[PDB]
Design an enzyme around this catalytic site. Structure first.
Site, short mmCIF file in Angstrom:
data_model
loop_
_atom_site.label_atom_id
_atom_site.label_comp_id
_atom_site.label_asym_id
_atom_site.label_seq_id
_atom_site.Cartn_x
_atom_site.Cartn_y
_atom_site.Cartn_z
N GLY A 1 21.49 -1.05 -3.41
CA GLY A 1 22.79 -1.45 -2.91
C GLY A 1 23.76 -1.93 -3.99
N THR B 1 13.97 -1.52 -6.71
CA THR B 1 12.61 -1.29 -6.22
C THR B 1 12.35 0.18 -5.90
OG1 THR B 1 12.34 -3.52 -5.31
CG2 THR B 1 10.94 -1.81 -4.40
N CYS B 2 13.31 0.86 -5.26
CA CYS B 2 13.06 2.24 -4.85
C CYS B 2 12.84 3.14 -6.06
CB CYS B 2 14.23 2.76 -3.99
SG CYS B 2 14.05 4.48 -3.45
N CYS C 1 10.29 4.18 -3.37
CA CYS C 1 10.38 5.51 -2.75
C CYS C 1 10.10 6.64 -3.73
CB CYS C 1 11.76 5.76 -2.13
SG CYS C 1 12.82 4.35 -1.82
N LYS D 1 6.34 6.71 -5.21
CA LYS D 1 5.33 6.89 -4.17
C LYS D 1 5.43 8.28 -3.55
CE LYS D 1 7.68 6.40 -0.16
NZ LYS D 1 7.51 6.11 1.24
N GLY E 1 20.90 -13.92 -12.71
CA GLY E 1 22.09 -14.56 -12.15
C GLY E 1 21.76 -15.61 -11.12
N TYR F 1 3.53 0.45 6.20
CA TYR F 1 3.70 1.80 5.67
C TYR F 1 3.35 1.85 4.19
CZ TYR F 1 8.31 0.73 3.55
OH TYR F 1 9.32 0.24 2.76
N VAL F 2 3.57 0.75 3.44
CA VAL F 2 3.20 0.75 2.02
C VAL F 2 1.69 0.88 1.86
CG1 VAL F 2 3.20 -0.60 -0.13
CG2 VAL F 2 5.24 -0.53 1.35
N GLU G 1 0.55 4.54 2.95
CA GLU G 1 1.01 5.58 2.04
C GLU G 1 0.21 5.57 0.75
OE1 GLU G 1 5.23 4.80 1.72
OE2 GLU G 1 5.75 6.09 3.43
N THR H 1 16.58 2.22 1.60
CA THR H 1 17.49 2.49 0.49
C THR H 1 18.81 3.12 0.95
OG1 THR H 1 16.00 2.48 -1.41
CG2 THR H 1 17.77 4.13 -1.46
N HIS I 1 12.96 30.46 14.43
CA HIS I 1 11.56 30.89 14.44
C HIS I 1 11.21 31.65 13.15
CE1 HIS I 1 7.75 32.02 16.33
NE2 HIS I 1 8.00 33.30 16.14
N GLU J 1 11.31 23.87 15.71
CA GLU J 1 11.80 24.54 16.91
C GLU J 1 11.09 24.07 18.17
OE1 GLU J 1 10.93 28.86 17.49
OE2 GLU J 1 9.36 28.69 15.95
#
Ligand SMILES: Cc1cc2nc3c(=O)[nH]c(=O)nc-3n(C[C@H](O)[C@H](O)[C@H](O)COP(=O)(O)OP(=O)(O)OC[C@H]3O[C@@H](n4cnc5c(N)ncnc54)[C@H](O)[C@@H]3O)c2cc1C
Ligand SMILES: Cc1cc2nc3c(=O)[nH]c(=O)nc-3n(C[C@H](O)[C@H](O)[C@H](O)COP(=O)(O)OP(=O)(O)OC[C@H]3O[C@@H](n4cnc5c(N)ncnc54)[C@H](O)[C@@H]3O)c2cc1C
Ligand SMILES: COC(=O)N1CCN(c2ccc(F)cc2)CC1
Ligand SMILES: COC(=O)N1CCN(c2ccc(F)cc2)CC1
Ligand SMILES: COC(=O)N1CCN(c2ccc(F)cc2)CC1
Lengths: 587, 586
Positions: free
Chosen positions: A113, A148-149, A154, A157, A223, A291-292, A295, A436, A565, A570
């Site tokens: 961000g 981090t990503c 992300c 990984k 900071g 999920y971490v 994965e 993210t 197809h 589909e």
């Protein structure tokens, strides 16, 4: 209405020109600003529906109703003749640079961000600083700019997931006629880590180049906000100093948690360490069920590791639990072991062999919810038991920024904190999805509201997700249980089906493991409340449907749309078996 | 209005029960039926807004206004007491099998549309026959039930494409840390074909089981419509006979064309032959530039073949030409050769196919470029120069079914031909997209309208497509040049971007994948067309087809958040316009 928008736009824009597309005096001013390399926002009044009202309101700040009008940090500077006067007398550069503060914007945190916010603000002439620092892990791991990503999330990984997926491509190739023998092929951890880290390095460098080329000041420093407009910074030499800024964006993210047990911090690792680990983890215990956790366990097993996951209660708390159980069943059938209803109570047997590039050896002791005991040895123990911010590092409590019970920042729907010039975006914004692309959208949209007079807000509802387990799980909207809880079972209809990818037929993979469903609301024209799919490329499948769900898709919209197809996706266009009917979903 | 719908529904339904969900007499009739194994449609009047009006209108057929009412082939049979009377007197079976015709429905053609139509009609009690026959190719190739897609189309071609994709997966594996050596691995064509054909055989068998289990009569015979209700059949012993049907669905598909040049029919092949060929084609010339031509040349090259494509004029005529050129440029950079602005004049045989040792023959191809210069050996020549129906084979001209100038059937928007009981679906329906999911939707929706009183029509607009070339190309809606022609260049804005799949980074091209949205300025930036060149392009495109169906704008894409890391998410943050002149590279 218009008057309050205009007042807010003038007060916070760094350099803004009110213009019309058809106006030759406006083009004369635009050219002067371009020649002097003065960046600015521009509002073309002839391209707005209430531009006539805006034109009249400008007179309340400038005493003129004509165009062009140029403002700097809330002050009317002049019309065409006056701007060119300042340019010819070499007074313009000083006028556009004078400020009560060192910076129009200070961003604390150089991740998903914060970098998006800082770059977008600088486009409109805001003088911007971005601060980033990476506190090392307990074993000393650190990394470069990007958050981090990019560095420990992300990006690495999913690359390690792709390495695991290629194991099945190797097996499948024989059935499609290629002469290789999968049995005699092995994987080299350090070779893959070197490739992953070289890509991450190219991203660290790309962000530093991007900041330079947008005239953003990058300070590699910690900071700390000590008052509404003052930021104390500490650099790599622990030199301390203070800088000031008009607007402040907090974008400092989170870090992994450790459980409060002996040996955890000393002898275990987290996802922060795993992506640059110089040796293969070996026999590995993953503690947690997010999920971490799943994965990481998933790709480790596909790369030939002996992997166990220790689960306190359920898998993927907060996701649809039917889908979560199908995800875990697939992993268990494809070489991941599970210790269910179990928690840890870690002893060191061997120190990490940093010479010969080998892990150590550990003894893990724990217990199950009924009281029985767990005891087993592992070479690596990975903790994935959640993440948390630590805003006490960042934010002096006297400043007045309100936090919730979890330590996240309480914000208005335009990211404003309880202090009028301070905002928060990304994972530390209380109550928002921690993803993210959400952080990037919030940061860019906020910068435009602050410095270009925009009005558009970030929409945080129905944001799609994908879990990149060995068989991937994509989702958008409500889980089935949340829909039933909110509307009642009799108002919910669920359409579902198993499917088999065409690619799996010749390869002799499983017939009835992939699965999809639509959770719908009967009393609202069969509105699609949630979409769920377990299968290959689940993120690519899910993304486009998130646009339809944003616009309020019903079951009839899915039915009238024709399938492509042959694809997995589909199958969403011809669903017809309901759960209420009792008919089997198998193919 | 309501009365014209009810008259139409009662006349053509085979067996239909008018009913209400809370009606114990209705439920008693429902039990007698299918206790006797009598399949039927049901309409629950309490679940329709004009159900009251329908109820009063029933009296014009039966002289009663209550439920249940049972009809058979347009005749009122009775209420509850009367149906039960016929049941316990053993008269019911004869009542519901009484027909002017042998079949309620005859489907001519057992492919994508025809099998779908036939199974769906049988669900509502229509006594149904499906006819299928496969006329052999010039070299003798034939196959089983299921039509073009199943046997010689979408299914084998995508499996061969997957075999080709796995070549680059073997390459990528080394960079991600796996120990194999790609340069020492080769491909065995016959092993591939054996696996593909074993899957096709399981589909042939599955369709025969499906028709048996739905009580559909399957005749492996060639059909010919000789009058509105009469179908002449010829079986595999050339025995001829005649069957009659109330409704007729024509669903006979198309077959490949050959150019009118010496040696084409005798020494070349088409896609019909390629998917079961017992030997590897070897050095191959593909003549044509359709999606069939480029998909086949593409996977042959990835499997180690020396492949050339002869292009008369342009690639993918009818598709967005910027996208078509990027597809072809990728193919040429990855080992496909192109003979551009070139056509063939003659094929000469130098060696006969060696059927003993399982090897191709050898051919000399002569042709010319459009400026007159000459073209002049290949082991295999594949023609992909279009497809055509041959209805003068299915349809006697005295029946009165109107055809267009290409020989396809002119239909109303409910698939009706100029003969009132005869319908047409699939590739032979003039003007419609020629795609398997369209034919399936058309066939199923038509069966429901004929035999269950449904009203829903098939929607043929904005149907998405994917070309499965080595780098895939997905699209939904207008090409950019078609949008500009329809609305003018000043009313069109194009947002676009290159992108790089994350999977391609560790594997080492930067700016080859590409996507764009073609939008209409004066209609709130409506998305007129979506285009993507990249891996898994059909999975990427499908979900966006729902949003375009509902009228998505650029603002709808902007407010939706991306899933990261994916290729598809690049659609949610597009911002570079073509008019701005800013580079789309990343
Ligand atoms: C293992 C893992 C996998 C993930 N996978 C995905 C995925 O596939 N998709 C997805 O959408 N999301 C994923 N996420 C989530 C994603 O990483 C986050 O949502 C996102 O990075 C948050 O962005 P941010 O800007 O809020 O913070 P961050 O990206 O964490 O950036 C904050 C930065 O500020 C720095 N900082 C902190 N305090 C200070 C200070 N006082 N002074 C200066 N700098 C400071 C931090 O060190 C960091 O560099 C994953 C997360 C993890 C942990
Ligand atoms: C190489 C190739 C690849 C393709 N790939 C795709 C793809 O990826 N996606 C997609 O959507 N579409 C694809 N298509 C198109 C798809 O195959 C067709 O749109 C679809 O099969 C048409 O269905 P149909 O029911 O109209 O006809 P068909 O499926 O062709 O069925 C007609 C059947 O009727 C039989 N028949 C003909 N005359 C008679 C007669 N007198 N009596 C009895 N039976 C008769 C025929 O032999 C055939 O079995 C592809 C086509 C080709 C050639
Ligand atoms: C305990 O002293 C601190 O407060 N510090 C230590 C030094 N830190 C730092 C900053 C930038 C960098 F590149 C490397 C290290 C910042 C925080
Ligand atoms: C030229 O004579 C014809 O009319 N024929 C020959 C027989 N054909 C047939 C039908 C079913 C089958 F399984 C194999 C062949 C049908 C067309
Ligand atoms: C134009 O070429 C590509 O886009 N390729 C590149 C490699 N990719 C792939 C496919 C399957 C797999 F298992 C692993 C990697 C995707 C397809």
């Amino acid at each position: 209405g218009t008057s309050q928008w205009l007042r807010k736009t003038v007060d916070s824009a760094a350099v803004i020109l009110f213009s019309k597309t058809t106006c030759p005096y406006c083009k004369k001013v635009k050219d002067v600003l371009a020649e002097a390399k003065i960046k600015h926002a521009t509002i073309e009044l002839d391209q707005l529906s209430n531009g006539s009202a805006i034109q009249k309101c400008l007179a309340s700040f400038s005493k003129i109703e004509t165009v062009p009008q140029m403002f700097v940090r809330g002050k009317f500077i002049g019309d065409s003749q006056t701007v060119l006067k300042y340019y010819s007398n070499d007074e313009l550069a000083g006028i556009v640079n004078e400020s009560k503060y060192d910076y129009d914007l200070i961003v604390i945190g150089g991740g998903s961000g914060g970098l998006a916010a800082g770059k977008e603000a600088a486009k409109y002439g805001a003088k911007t600083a971005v601060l980033d620092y990476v506190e090392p892990t307990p074993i000393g791991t650190t990394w470069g700019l990007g958050g981090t990503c990019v560095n420990v999330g992300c990006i690495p990984k999913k690359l390690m997931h792709q390495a695991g997926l290629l194991s099945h491509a190797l097996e499948d190739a024989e059935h499609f006629g290629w002469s290789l023998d999968r049995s005699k092929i092995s994987h080299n951890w350090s070779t893959m880590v070197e490739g992953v880290q070289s890509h991450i390095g190219s991203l660290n460098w790309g962000y530093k180049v991007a900041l330079r080329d947008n005239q953003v000041t990058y300070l590699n420093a910690k900071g700390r906000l000590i008052s509404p407009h003052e930021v104390q910074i500490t650099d790599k030499n622990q030199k301390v100093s203070t800088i000031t800024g008009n607007k402040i964006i907090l974008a400092t993210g989170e870090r992994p948690k450790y459980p409060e047990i002996p040996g955890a911090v000393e002898y275990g690792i987290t996802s922060d360490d795993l992506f640059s680990l110089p040796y293969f983890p070996g026999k590995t215990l993953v503690i947690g069920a997010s999920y971490v956790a799943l994965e990481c366990a998933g790709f480790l097993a596909s790369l030939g590791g002996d992997v166990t996951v220790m689960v306190r209660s359920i898998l993927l708390r907060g996701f649809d639990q039917q889908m979560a159980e199908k995800v875990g069943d697939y992993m268990e059938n494809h070489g991941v072991k599970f210790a269910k209803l179990c928690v840890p109570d870690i002893k060191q047997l061997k120190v990490v062999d940093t010479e010969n590039n080998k892990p150590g050896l550990l003894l893990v002791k724990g217990h199950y919810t009924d009281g029985k005991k767990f005891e087993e040895e592992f070479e690596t123990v990975i903790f994935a038991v959640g993440r948390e911010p630590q805003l006490s590092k960042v934010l002096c409590e006297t400043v007045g920024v309100k936090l919730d019970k979890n330590g996240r920042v309480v914000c208005t729907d335009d990211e404003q904190t309880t202090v009028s010039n301070v905002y928060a975006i990304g994972d530390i914004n209380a109550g928002k999805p921690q993803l993210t692309p959400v952080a990037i959208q919030a940061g860019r949209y906020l910068a435009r509201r602050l410095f270009a007079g925009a009005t558009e807000l970030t929409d945080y509802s129905n944001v799609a997700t994908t879990v990149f387990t060995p068989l991937e799980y994509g989702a958008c909207g409500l889980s089935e249980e949340d829909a039933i809880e909110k509307y009642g079972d009799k108002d919910i209809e669920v359409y579902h089906s198993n499917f088999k990818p065409l690619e799996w037929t010749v390869a002799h993979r499983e017939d009835n493991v992939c699965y999809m469903k639509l959770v719908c609301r009967k009393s609202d024209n069969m509105r699609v409340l949630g979409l769920h799919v377990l299968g290959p490329n689940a993120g690519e499948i899910t993304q486009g449907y998130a646009v339809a769900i944003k616009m309020g898709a019903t079951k009839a919209d899915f039915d009238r749309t024709i399938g492509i197809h042959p694809t997995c996706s589909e199958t969403f266009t011809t669903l017809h078996v309901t759960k209420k009917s009792g008919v089997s979903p198998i193919v």
